[PDB]
């Protein structure tokens, strides 16, 4: 009961982190009270009751019904601590008054008042920090519960709504409340405490001064109204900035998720300039908001002297004054100014932010839902949404395969979604058993082992798993990795090839036992032989007992299919059978800008001039009462004489934002120029979290926190120096305090930094799991694995929250053991109970009263400095047509498996050198090694210029790339086709022609103006391939490395690729990696990547 009160349970973790490293096991396990599952259960029950019983559902009521009693129980103790703070200066002024021979009504009562002031100090100690920690815990619990509720709603979110809300919206939504909602609950409870403290202090100052407390309160109220107006005007500057932040975040997320494609296209300058275009707009509002918040937070320091002036003039002008009763006024007014200028506007701002976040989150939870209501799949007169489908109708019995064929953009995938239940048929009905197994057209590989990616959250079945992995031809690929079957794949499956990803997705679809199977072209990225073997082993032999609908464009599959449905423009052209058809961090933060140092020098010079002026004025100015109170007045009013005005704080804020600008620009340039192996080393959710938080902190929190720390440090230094020049014993007495302060701060910093880094790197899993949940929500709701993904999210939330709560508990231990212990049990007990010299060491109390605040600001600065440390650690990253290659070894890592081992060949100019090889052989590896994206070796001399005779970008400029991973970023069709805008709309409309996008672009509301959100989800997969083809055509170059251009096209649309090959690339060399026999027939030279070694053939007949 006392261990929790004193937070002595953090002793073991602090002791371990003092001399060791907190890797994974010494982080304490989460308690059961704040477990994410339990918190989500309680909040979900309350929210469901609220929207079932009330008329206008409000999340604030649901949160109140479960947290209000604890909130108020901590708030009353917080108010008691504030009351002990506001009653302290009465005792202080009645104690330090007994320092002169004047013994008026004070005889032998200082010894009876010091022991009371000590008790008040210790009761403030025991009553403030536990309440603050309780409020922090309540905030963390509320954040956990709301995050889990949001994740459940996202799992249940409709498909139509997802067409507009993207990853950036969600990541910006959880970026703020993850580290502000918790810390605001210890500051939003001053809304009724600050008025009460103001009332109490007004009563006391009316007791002291007759009728000047109200006169001072008038100016204080005017300043508080101005502060509230500034806060309201500042909320607007963040509302208009959140959208820009989200857009930049999603743009850079798509950029880094396809950094291979960016490097292949040489889109480093283009995408850098694109991101800075949004960065400038965001930073304009960031700078405006930072100026406004500087003026809002500097109204405390530049108000003390004016408040004292206005509260003394109407009394001292007619009734006299003495230093005792002006110092009591100053002591009361310091607390009054803090309460009404630093505590009430802060509380109002925090309440506004919390209510806005709660309302936005409730709006998110109040979006459209996703409704679903012998497996004889019937479908009659179904129309989908111009209509994507039109009068599509079919009937399938149990154990009867049906094949859906048609042109690109016909609506085969759309029909599959209408079958599953995602798309809403405006007219018609769908009748089938609920169980559905889906193999998406673009395979989705979630982070985790291959076993997890295949089983997908069901009971492990040895025989079924072996049969699936043997039928899908995946055993050969599986028995090559260091882990035989349980090998961990990165997010998005970037370690595997396209064919391996397709095989894994098809295996996952097959493994699940469902009545209906929707194989959305599972043989798109697979070559002819593997596709044939999989079709007659995993679609016609294993699952030859249950109905399955698969999209195909091969006459063999159509002949096998018992029913054929051909779609053209969304209309069922034919529906029958085939037979029927046949008829250093600080040192580098400051020095990264050549103007931050100048601003700091200016501030230091002005501060020194102000200190000299104060010292000479005090020397000129300085009986018995006035012989020692003058320094007390100066050190109680120093917060105004040594405050930064608009001449030394506004430039500091501006430079501290420009530092964030240059840091982000350098970090983005380093990301673009980082080696591909190191980019593979990191993740994508981690990159998104870094660009979301470690730049937002630098933009908003860090400049203002550094301003506050410098303000407090300057005030402390000036108050020390001016008084110590006159009275050196002040600085003599302050040393034994500051040494312990610095000692404890250092003793806790080397563990707080580790905990902060652990929290920062434990934040990435939540974002990287939500990213995959949103990317594969389609298959998630097809498979019904929402409970499994909810359990995964809860595990990730617990993993992050245990670490974060441990860090906050350690920080609270430090901020208690310094503030309310290392002052209250040393200074306020041995500097007041020495009543014998009591003037030259009692002012140490008053100086330390703000030195502890300076130390708090410094420790907050160092806590925030971890973001800059991470940003800098990222910044430190390193950086005719003939071809002749020799001794080329393409390894993805220095110590991995050499994919190619001494491959050598020659390519004549104007020769289409097609490339063959089974899936997983290394064809894409060879194409990437041509651009030396990976490590690579040897020389790729082209007409004379070798690898080392030309810089990397100039080398890559002479290549045309069509990657298997189609890269489309957010932006218009014009931007997608040419970020550099080298060719105008007239010169790109022709490229849209002769490629098949004339009938596709014009369908959208804006011709070359539609914003392709969600990674080009609006287009189909064939249209994505055609867009990449058109982009390659626009990027007029030679020695094109075509990497499966017609990956999912059909022979009707493959003629587009064919005539583009024979027209646009009239005289050049093509290295096309197409798996289509029709496209391979026209090639003049062939390379077969077998046994990890290429060959040199000359004709198809010599090939076979
Ligand atoms: N980034 C990577 N890091 C490590 N290994 C990789 C990486 N990318 C691919 N591999 C592996 O190295 C080998 C090279 O395959 P590659 O990616 O070149 O595909 P591929 O044979 O061209 O594919 P397909 O014909 O199916 O399109 C494969 O075994 C693949 O799983
Ligand atoms: N999310 C979406 N919002 C609006 N229109 C969409 C969306 N997804 C697809 N479409 C459009 O619906 C039509 C049908 O596309 P669909 O993906 O069903 O084609 P498909 O037959 O699967 O094509 P492919 O041969 O490329 O696989 C196209 O005109 C496409 O642009
Ligand atoms: C926490 C707050 C709301 C409690 C109520 C306000 C208090 C602080 C105010 C209201 C009335 C005030 C009192 C009004 C009159 C007197 C008589 C005078 O000879 C001594 C001070 C004294 C006793 C004042 C002290 C402060 C006082 C008690
Ligand atoms: Mg499709
Ligand atoms: Mg490939």
Author numbering: 11 to 383, 389 to 400, 438 to 635, 847 to 885, 908 to 1121, 1129 to 1171, 1207 to 1431
Per the authors:
Topological analysis of CFTR places it in the ATP-binding Cassette (ABC) transporter family, which harnesses the energy from ATP hydrolysis to move substrates across cell membranes. Once the R domain is phosphorylated, ATP-binding induced NBD dimerization and subsequent hydrolysis of ATP in site 2 are coupled to the opening and closing of the CFTR pore, respectively.
The current study reported two cryo-EM structures of E1371Q-CFTR proteins produced by a lentiviral expression system. The yield of the E1371Q-CFTR mutant is high, ensuring that the sample can be effectively concentrated for cryo-grids freezing and that abundant protein particles can be imaged for cryo-EM structure determination. The sharp and symmetric elution peak of E1371Q-CFTR proteins from size exclusion chromatography (SEC) indicates that the sample has high purity and homogeneity, both of which are characteristics ideal for cryo-EM studies. The negative staining images of E1371Q-CFTR, in which individual intact CFTR protein molecules can be readily discerned, show that the proteins are mono-dispersed and not prone to aggregate at room temperature. With this high-quality sample, the electron density map of E1371Q-CFTR was determined at an overall resolution of 3.4 Å where densities of the side chains for most amino acids are clearly defined. Thus, the mutations introduced to stabilize the CFTR protein do not disturb the overall structure of the E1371Q-CFTR protein.
